[PDB]
């Protein structure tokens, strides 16, 4: 969602612990805490303008400016306006066609919690589809389907699992990529608008094959129309079906009706996984109160922690839905994990409490 590294003691990390980011994120803010007036006893940033000039290797830190690396379309604002802390920010574009990395550092005085800064950008795993109908030339040499690809002012386009759609429209069109046209809508994870250049992130888990969304952009007195639709594929959900109803659009691995068991036994529902590379969906369907907040804040195994904090993988999308009183929370995962980890979520209805433990292996 958003990456933040605390260099004050108010957050999780305190500065009076390192920040490593190995991800591929797209058009997002990066906040950096730095107190200056309050107290800077030899407290510096290395170099002084880190977001403008930043070194390349910790074994030999040489001076290198941002414009001499290979990054595309960035934004570096350095605000010193907040009365509590000072902020440093930068935005990342996905059009980067290489894997580049850098290092920054910070020094203290009093054994004052020295922290290290390491960030590496990844070229987007899937591919992106550009359509620059507006007259504006780009040297990115991407896949661009211009005016000609429309069949009588309409464009039908299917998206594989996890692709991005790019649309250049300097003209202001409302309800863009949020008003579906059929009975169900093609729910996107991320829709953002910079320089009115549209972006649609295709989710990995959908419900019905007949879902769609629209945008009615205009160009040279002509109303063109783009319709999105997913390449459908039904996937099982690893987890436990607790709701008694059988007519559902979701398919669970483990299943048990929590309403028909006895009150004397609070049984569990364990789930284990062991593959080299992962691409599965994990969740549960609980008719009762789900505690804690799953799956963004799962319960620690044998304490409340963040989900991404234990898996150490940025590619974790979250999906939610309900069918009457049935509450269905889940999440997807892609990529090998660093170390074998575990976590639990809990479902509770009236005088019944079931626990769903999940274990994910590294090898």
């Amino acid at each position, epitope marked *: 969602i958003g990456y933040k590294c605390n260099f004050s003691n108010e957050g999780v990390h305190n500065l009076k612990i390192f920040c490593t980011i190995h991800s591929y994120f797209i058009y997002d803010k990066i906040r950096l805490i730095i107190p200056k007036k309050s107290s800077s006893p030899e407290f510096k940033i290395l170099p002084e303008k880190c977001f403008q000039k930043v070194y390349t290797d910790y074994e030999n830190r040489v001076e290198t400016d941002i414009s001499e690396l290979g990054l595309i379309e960035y934004e570096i604002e350095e605000n010193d306006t907040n009365p509590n802390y000072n902020e440093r920010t930068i935005t990342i574009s996905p059009f980067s066609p290489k894997d580049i990395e850098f290092f920054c550092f910070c020094d203290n005085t009093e054994e004052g919690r020295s922290a290290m800064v390491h960030v590496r950008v990844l070229k987007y795993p899937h591919n992106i589809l550009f359509t620059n109908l507006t007259n504006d030339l780009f040297t990115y040499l991407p896949k661009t389907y211009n005016e000609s*690809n429309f*069949v009588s002012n309409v464009l039908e386009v*299917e998206l594989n699992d996890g692709e991005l759609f790019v649309l250049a429209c300097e003209l202001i069109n409302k309800k863009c990529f949020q008003e579906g046209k059929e009975k169900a809508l093609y729910k996107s994870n991320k829709i953002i608008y910079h320089k009115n250049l549209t972006i649609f992130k295709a989710p990995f888990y959908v419900t019905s094959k007949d879902v769609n969304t629209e945008c009615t952009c205009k160009f040279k007195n002509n109303n063109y129309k783009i319709v999105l*639709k997913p390449k459908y594929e039904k996937k099982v959900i690893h987890g436990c079906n607790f709701s008694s109803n059988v007519s559902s659009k979701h398919t669970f691995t483990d299943s048990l009706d929590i309403s028909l068991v006895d009150d004397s036994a609070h049984i569990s529902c364990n789930v284990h996984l062991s593959e080299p590379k992962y691409n599965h969906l994990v969740g549960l369907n609980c008719p009762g109160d789900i505690i804690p907040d799953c799956f963004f804040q799962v319960y620690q195994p044998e304490n409340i922690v963040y989900l991404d904090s234990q898996i150490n993988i940025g590619d974790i999308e979250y999906y939610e839905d309900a069918e009457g009183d049935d509450k269905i929370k889940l999440f997807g995962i892609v990529g090998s994990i660093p170390k074998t980890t575990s976590f639990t979520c809990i479902c509770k209805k009236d005088k019944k409490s079931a626990y769903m433990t999940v274990t994910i292996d590294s090898a």
Partner: antibody
Amino acid sequence: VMLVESGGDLVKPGGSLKVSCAASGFTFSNYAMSWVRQTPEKRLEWVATISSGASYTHYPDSVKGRFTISRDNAKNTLYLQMSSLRSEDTAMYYCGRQVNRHDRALDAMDYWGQGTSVTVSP
Amino acid sequence: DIVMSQSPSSLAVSVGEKVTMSCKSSQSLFYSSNQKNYLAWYQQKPGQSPKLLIYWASTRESGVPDRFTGSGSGTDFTLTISSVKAEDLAVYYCQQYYSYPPTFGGGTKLEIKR
């Protein structure tokens, strides 16, 4: 490149029939498919086309509703469900393949099938 | 909703002379940006499947002899062959693909001089 049809059989006026079309020599999921029929007057006419991902489907206004196009990429097969047939619907049916050299949803057919004869007479 | 008027219907030509065919169109078939005419010509050999010959109403496909040459623009379209062979006795249809639905012509049979 090979395209085998199957299912040609007579049916009483108003009945239904399902036909198939197998593919060989290319990746099925990368190309759009279509069907074309030929009257006894050797006059050609388009009947239905379906996209690669089997989401966007188009029919002509004459046969809308009764004809249902469908594809199964796992088996490399193309299906067409005809319902409530009439005297007019009797013809020879081919499953041509749309060309994707141009990234347009509508294009010409490079390779055609051999055909299979359906009959409506009672 | 697109009328493709093919003429003539029959065509008795000698063995090796220049033959000319026409395909009339009820509307313009030309994208000004791409500068290409949306039309295609086919060949249905006797008792066989129809095969594509000329797309974009000008260019040939891989596997088509040089004798064939498509021509025309806008609505008036012409198809010209040079040195006719002997099994070229097919019925040639012209299809449009500017807008749905793709309509076809009535075809033109090829009678051989004898």
